[PDB]
Amino acid sequence: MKAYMFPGQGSQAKGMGRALFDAFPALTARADGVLGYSIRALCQDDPDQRLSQTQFTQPALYVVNALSYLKRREEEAPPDFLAGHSLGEFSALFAAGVFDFETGLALVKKRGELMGDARGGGMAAVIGLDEERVRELLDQNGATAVDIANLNSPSQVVISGAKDEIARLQVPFEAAGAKKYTVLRVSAAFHSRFMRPAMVEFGRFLEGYDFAPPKIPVISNVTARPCKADGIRAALSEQIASPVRWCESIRYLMGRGVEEFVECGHGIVLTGLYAQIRRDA
Template sequence: MITYLFPGQGSQKQGMGSSLFDEFKELTEQADETLGYSMKRLCLENPYSNLHKTQFTQPALYVVNALSYLKKIQETNIQPDYAAGHSLGEYNALFAAGAFDFITGLQLVRKRGELMSMATDGKMAAVMGLTESQVADVLHTRELHTVDIANINSPHQVVISGRKEDIERAKAVFEGIKDVTMFHPLNVSGAFHSRYMSEAKEEFKKFLQSFHFSAISIPVISNVHARPYEQDGIRSVLADQIDHSVRWNESIHYLMNKGRMEFEEVGPGHVLTGLIHRIKKETEPSGAV
């Protein structure tokens, strides 16, 4: 069995998709028309450093991931057995599963990026060396009650999210803990996947009401539940994803426990491939599904 994995924010880089825009000229033109700017120029020239601004990053990654997927299918003619994506990448997993067409997905992602970019004064940081429960315990005992767990990326890589000053306070706390191997602030403008995104979530929930979702042709593992999407739950899960934790570690374990599973990252970079190696190294599948 094979699972295609689609990366999210943080995997963007100037030059991504360079060979794809001319190859998929019609889709690139449709994307430009939908967005009102040139996707090729954004990705290859990165004017005004826009590629690293959330409202531009999310559509750019979605387009490059989607074209990478279409290219892969063209070359191999192999449909995956499962699909999953990290945060924004989940939209590409749903696209691969036929839940919506290319432009519908882009419209969703554009709105999501706009709403998330409006949540400023937030920060995120990766804590390496502690488990999710250990991080939660530190947040509780050290009275960091305004900081949330945003991503559980591997057994010992947990991302926290909150206001800038609270993440700074957390930095001093975590760096004083013996088992913490690294505290790494992420280059993001908002406290994504936390309580501070609740306003963006509510706005996005309203936006989703006008969209129709087609039948999912392959199981897509949701970040929110670490289980496959249910057809009638697509809207609510996509809205919840904005202010809920990304349960990546649990999602990968769910897939590993399905049997002999291969994982292929589709899109720019190797972030998810690295996390798969980390997950396999740090734990063994339990056998439970």
Template sequence: MSVVWAFPGQGAQRVGMGAGVLDRYPDLVRQADEILGYPIREVCLRGAEPGLTDTRSVQPALFVVNALSWLARREEGPAPDYLAGHSLGEYDALFAAGCFDFATGVRLTRRRGEIMGRAGGGGMLAVVGADPDHLAEVLERGGIDGVDLA
């Protein structure tokens, strides 16, 4: 049987995340604090400012918790056969695969959060099982353009 580790993306955050791993890796937490300029532990455990609703802080917070969870699990169990990540979680999968170090991951996800924080509001919708031609017709009637159908 294959072992797969899949890392979640934004939306998986919650106050209290990382409670089991943040104290286990104080040097890495300190490194993240220095890079980010605020205490990541307080953001993760208490939702302290800048908080867990702002993508600029959520993205590095999730990276840190997922990366530390990976390090803890790697010490305790078998290595996975495969690594995967959903959206932001891809950065943790790349870290776990050895593509870059922890500090680089914190910097990358901080920058990603900053860029996404500046992006205009938008939305996403998944309509599963609908006829693509019918959807295109409905969008056209509504004067909606710039929508990708896959």
């Protein structure tokens, strides 16, 4: 059994998807219709470094992920399971037939707008400490307005919360053995109940859409379990204000009997995480 893993923000790069745009002109033109600009130009030329701006990053990654999936479907047996990291969930749901290509793109355009417009707090990516140690450090350093935002691998955790606390934690984390502590280029503290207002707004926006049942199971970032057909809106809206349980999602799949994990999209970010999750598990 095989799972496809769809990457999210941070995996984008100038030049991504070139051969896919060539191969899928109808979807390229349809993407342009939703976005109002050339998706190929965004990805190939990266005008004014817009690929690093979340309102553009999210649609770019959704399109490249989607086309990457369709290329794999032409060439390889279908996957048994799908999982996407944050933005990647939307590509996974597209692959599963939950919504059509344009609908998913509209959802991600909105997610990009909500996240670009969000304010308050920040985030840091930590390499070299496990969840238990990170939680201990947050308590020891009195960072009561910081929480764990992503559990990405046994040694890769993202934290989120008050900007001053995120700044002040860097040296203590490094002194405890973090190999790297990197404050992220994000508008706000995502993946805590701090982001509740945006979660509420996104939920309301999703009421206007009509979803289909997944044809292939999609493992939710929120629950680390398969998305329920009746639960798409909760899965997607709550995701932005909840910890991303990526490590647990991969471990769930391993426990179900999945032996082959393939990254579907540009880059090797999730491949790297998987190697680390696999080595520990």
